[PDB]
Ligand binder design. Structure first.
Ligand SMILES: [Zn+2]
Length: 140
């Protein structure tokens, strides 16, 4: 589990969205495993606006933050999980690392801010849903 709180927005994995997230929906994209809902209180996370390929991510299943190199956001084929069949997921970045289903929502961050959240795992890899292209998260 885990979310990003920026301005009046809450960013979560689409497969973990709650009733309140759907009732206050701003934007969602199944192919990216992302959903954004509106919040009453202002959040304090900053979204990275960069092309970094190194950062640190939180892995709840090991209670550890790991420094990683991660790939550029792309259409990546992902094996079947408990929450999606085998398919291409878009705007996904991979790193070598541990990722179990409950690790979804863990933040990946670089010197500029939040890069994305854990979305996929298995085969010794961890995949992160990028949010750096969602410029509208910074305003309105
Ligand atoms: Zn960066």
């Amino acid at each position: 589990s885990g979310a990003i709180y920026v301005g009046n927005y809450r960013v979560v994995n689409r497969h973990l969205a709650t009733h309140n997230d759907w009732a206050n929906l701003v934007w969602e994209d199944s192919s990216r495993d992302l959903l954004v809902s509106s919040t009453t209180a202002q959040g304090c996370d900053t979204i990275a606006r960069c092309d970094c390929q190194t950062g640190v991510y939180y892995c709840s299943s090991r209670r550890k933050h790991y420094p990683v190199s991660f790939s550029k956001p792309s259409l990546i084929f992902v094996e079947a999980s408990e929450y999606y069949p085998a398919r291409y997921q878009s705007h996904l970045m991979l790193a070598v690392g541990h990722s179990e289903p409950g690790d979804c929502g863990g933040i990946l961050r670089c010197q500029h801010g939040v890069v994305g959240i854990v979305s996929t795992g298995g085969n010794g890899l961890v995949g992160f849903a990028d949010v750096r292209d969602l410029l509208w998260l910074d305003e309105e």
